[PDB]
Design a protein around this ligand. Structure first.
Ligand SMILES: [Mg+2]
Length: 68
RNA sequence: CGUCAAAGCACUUUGCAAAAGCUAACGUAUCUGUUUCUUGCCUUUUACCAGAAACAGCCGUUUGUAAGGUGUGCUAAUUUGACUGUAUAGUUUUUGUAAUCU
């Protein structure tokens, strides 16, 4: 991460660990290899929260751009 | 080669689907890109250097199947599959040592 990390979430159905930070990018860490595999890009500013949907394969992030 | 069965057959165009299960060339051939690391050259970025891991793309290949095209046929041609496939009265089976009664 380039800047402060502001949100983590360990998926209970995948061996993943999603993280977000004030550096505007959301990362998907593969916990089987401890390496970043996915990048989620659209965010105009820092990201302050990260949550994972309990059932679907979808995640929600909300940040300073007044948009979730 | 033979008998039986069903399928028109040979070449070809396109669509659809699939392609390691028991460690192994779908391709005896061989490119590119992204991410995360470690490097090289480095004044800063692109373009770069060369090794790894995880992913993708492109050039191709094979098979199945569906609908067509061309040339020849259905007054036959070819293909695919299956088959416990052959003679023979002269001792080892199928051209009778049978009848007779008990
Ligand atoms: Mg500048």
């Amino acid at each position: 991460h380039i800047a402060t990390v502001r949100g983590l979430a360990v998926s209970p159905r995948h061996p993943y660990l999603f993280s977000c930070g004030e550096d505007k990018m959301v990362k998907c860490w593969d916990l089987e290899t401890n390496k970043v595999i996915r990048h989620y890009h659209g965010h105009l500013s820092g990201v302050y929260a990260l949550k994972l949907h309990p059932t679907l394969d979808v995640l929600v992030t909300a940040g300073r751009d007044a948009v979730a």
